[PDB]
Write a protein that binds this ligand. Structure first.
Ligand code: HEM
Ligand code: HEM
Ligand SMILES: NCc1ccc(C(=O)N2CCC3(CC2)N=C(N)c2c(F)cccc2N3)cc1
Ligand SMILES: NCc1ccc(C(=O)N2CCC3(CC2)N=C(N)c2c(F)cccc2N3)cc1
Ligand SMILES: C[C@H](O)[C@H](O)[C@H]1CNc2nc(N)[nH]c(=O)c2N1
Ligand SMILES: C[C@H](O)[C@H](O)[C@H]1CNc2nc(N)[nH]c(=O)c2N1
Lengths: 417, 417
């Protein structure tokens, strides 16, 4: 009937019933796998079978009208009929603006790996389903970036491009994120910039983009429209807001010459809703300090500044047991938060975020008897057990609507020219 | 054929084949659940069915002889025959000392939640399968504690009590750990000592144990022998080695009056091997600093000293974004490591431990194509992504031999007197 969940920090118990509405993934528990097939929705070469589409469409429409505080029975029935007829006569159907808005928010609510879901009801939706060219995609994206950045007062938004038709005319953003720094393999063998974007940077260069060989060069947008070859578009520098890193006490921190972008936006995910699939739907929220201070700046395969910060603090960087790494990573986190705050750019520390999600989870179980959550992604990369999420048992399941991963476009794309 | 595993810090790929030898657990991924049924092996009221026992026995014997560098075919066949005959004539069978040693080490190797498995081959085995009374259990346990403590130079050991026969004569240690501090609900409503042991402490008191109402009172051993009612035995103070907490710089840290025991030993788990079950098999290794500094001292449901340490450091304890918690927990971790080191008591910091396990995992895949690992338990409660384990994809599966959890004895015990 329900799965029992326990919070070992408060002793509180919760009953999960929502998992029954899961779509089942089948299968050596693969919890720590980053990109499993169960969270990936691949490409197609033919339209969605009507026997599959119609049932999902009905299901979604029922969910939509079932969300209203005061039911609108006639509208419900009418919409059910209109959708069916549209599917029979066209082979698919178009969501109303309100349905799309509901779908985007529900898919956000259903994102197990997002710790900021308490904000789920606050989301700006940009309808670009009429987009037809790469140039138009670029314009829509620039508008998204501008609205979201909002001069430092970050706002959550999502831009919905045309849904997948037959699978050969997909709208896709080849970039993993809207804003990301380039990575270069220098002549002397050293790596410059973000080491994690070496391959994608080389791809942009291969497509005509001009490499600037800097530490923080913003990558261009590689846009695919109507299934045609991807076109490169440089992001107008005036639209990219950045924060220069400074430490409240360590004046030498500035000497590191570090900075980061204010806008965190995923650009390569697919929105699934009522049998439909939107291969291009970039969305954004705001940053959590640890993402930059810990992952971007301290991962060894990224900027890897940990040791350098250690020496500058005068720590015993040659003795692991000294816990110098713990001390350093924290000052870096302090720098990130301090800089964003000083420059009036929205950001949240991991402690506040963790308590925020706990409140949300509590609200979700009360509202719909559950909240899909991936513990591995919800617990911060530092001070894990200091946050309440660490002590909270969670159930991870895939509902609908949902935001899926996709197979890298360059691996499945059929080149024309 | 094999599952692909990737380390995102080195890019290294691994092929897991060992998971095929898993015993299958069936089923809303329940990865973050602490005590799931799949990791629990409950009580019985009748002997193990021969149709089930024999196949497992054969399987184990084959594994044992199959581990030798230079095969001993005749011995193998002979043992297979002897076991079968013993099972038919007695209804069960006895493992040889060497088989038990192999079983205990293999079960350790198969513990997905243990980060210290690189030491798997270094284990002292105490054969107490001839034990018959609670008094004898107490003596065996005191010997274990003495050998393991070794005046600060901690040694890994396990004491194997008589295997389960019919299920009504089980040898069980009611304590979760060999050494643990009491928790008291004081008259003024405040909690004194380890808040997590309130219930078990009350149980000891109900069994005649005399409460000392201290902050660090070592709990007595509650021993069950031959299925009879549990008897209480106080642990001789001379056998309990403790470390007084001091900070290398903060002279005021000592004013906190903190200390902890040097011997980390689980006492309520069950060893499963070749169809047999040993409900009582206490084992120990050595401490990892974070267990004490982070979980014992900083969990809110435990000693909860975080805020107090924060104020004493003069931090902004009323502003989460200041990251005062991160700064404090680290100094506490520094104190723990410093104190254990100064007092010459074996301990490992989480960084060294993490790199140690990574080496082990590498060895395991090379040796047998796999290593069962629970990421959620292997990543430390602080500085998660700073350790390599965080970036390592892992497969969690249950093999055999294996150390299982058990249903709390006081919930299933049938009282005599
Ligand atoms: C209100 C601000 C928001 C905050 C602070 C927030 C924060 C986060 C964080 C910290 C992560 C983990 C990132 C990583 O480790 O790669 C994440 C993941 C995610 N978020 Fe949220 N988020 C917000 C808004 C949104 C919005 C508006 C959507 C979608 C409509 C969303 C969808 C997701 C999804 C699908 C993931 C998983 C991405 C992946 O698998 O790489 N989030 N978010
Ligand atoms: C050589 C020293 C060893 C170290 C440093 C070590 C360390 C650890 C640590 C840190 C944990 C997690 C504890 C927790 O969070 O509750 C653990 C769990 C575990 N260890 Fe090891 N260990 C060692 C030896 C052993 C030995 C000798 C055995 C058994 C023969 C063993 C069996 C296990 C098992 C079964 C678990 C899971 C316990 C549970 O689920 O509560 N370990 N160990
Ligand atoms: N593995 C290397 C890597 C990955 C992602 C980013 C990146 O640009 N990020 C990190 C993930 C990201 C979006 C910004 N961070 C958020 N706060 C975010 C968000 F606010 C909403 C939805 C998804 C998000 N994910 C940088 C580097
Ligand atoms: N949840 C409250 C709690 C749990 C366990 C202990 C405890 O005594 N511990 C923590 C777990 C423990 C054994 C010592 N720590 C180890 N290093 C250990 C070990 F060395 C070998 C096997 C199992 C172990 N587990 C204290 C408090
Ligand atoms: C192997 C492991 O799944 C991987 O390193 C993880 C774990 N936890 C994470 N959690 C978040 N939020 N983001 C991540 O990228 C990861 N990566
Ligand atoms: C809910 C969650 O499983 C629980 O808090 C965990 C997680 N990680 C852990 N990891 C270890 N090593 N030990 C623990 O007790 C826990 N507890």
């Amino acid at each position: 009937q329900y799965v029992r969940i326990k919070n070992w920090g408060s002793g509180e118990i919760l009953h999960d019933t929502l998992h029954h509405k899961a779509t089942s993934d089948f299968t050596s528990c693969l919890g720590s796998i980053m990109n499993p097939k169960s969270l990936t929705r691949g490409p197609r070469d033919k339209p969605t079978p009507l026997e599959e589409l119609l049932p999902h469409a009905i299901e979604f429409i029922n969910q939509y009208y079932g969300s209203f505080k005061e039911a609108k029975i006639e509208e419900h029935l009418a919409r059910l009929e209109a959708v069916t007829k549209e599917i029979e006569t066209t082979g698919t159907y178009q969501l109303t603006l309100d349905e799309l808005i509901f779908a985007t928010k529900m898919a956000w609510r259903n994102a197990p790996r997002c710790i900021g879901r308490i904000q789920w009801s606050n989301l700006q939706v940009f309808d670009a389903r009429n987009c037809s060219t790469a140039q138009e995609m670029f314009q829509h994206i620039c508008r998204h970036i501008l609205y979201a950045t909002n001069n430092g007062n970050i706002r959550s938004a999502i831009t919905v491009f045309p849904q997948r038709s037959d699978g050969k005319h997909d709208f896709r953003l080849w970039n993993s994120q809207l804003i990301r720094y380039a990575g270069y393999q220098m002549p002397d063998g050293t790596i410059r910039g973000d080491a994690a974007t070496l391959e994608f940077t080389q791809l942009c260069i291969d497509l005509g983009w001009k490499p600037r060989y800097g530490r923080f060069d913003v990558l261009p947008l590689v846009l695919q429209a109507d299934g045609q070859d991807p076109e490169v578009f440089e992001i107008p520098p005036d639209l990219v807001l950045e924060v220069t890193m400074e430490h409240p006490k360590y004046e030498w921190f500035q000497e590191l010459g570090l900075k980061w972008y204010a806008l965190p936006a995923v650009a390569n995910m697919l929105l699934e809703v009522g049998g439909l699939e939107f291969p291009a739907c970039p969305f954004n929220g705001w940053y959590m300090g640890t993402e930059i201070g810990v992952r971007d700046f301290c991962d060894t395969q990224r900027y890897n500044i940990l040791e350098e910060v250690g020496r500058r603090m005068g720590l015993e960087t040659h003795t692991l047991a000294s816990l110098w790494k713990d001390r350093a990573v924290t000052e870096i986190n302090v720098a990130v938060l301090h800089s964003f705050q000083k420059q009036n750019v929205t950001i949240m520390d991991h402690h506040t975020a963790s308590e925020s999600f706990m409140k949300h989870m509590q609200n979700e179980y009360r509202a719909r008897g559950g909240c899909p959550a991936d513990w591995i992604w919800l617990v911060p990369p530092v001070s894990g057990s200091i946050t309440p999420v660490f002590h909270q048992e969670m159930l991870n399941y895939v509902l609908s609507p949902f935001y899926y991963y996709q197979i890298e476009p360059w691996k499945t794309h059929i080149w024309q020219n």
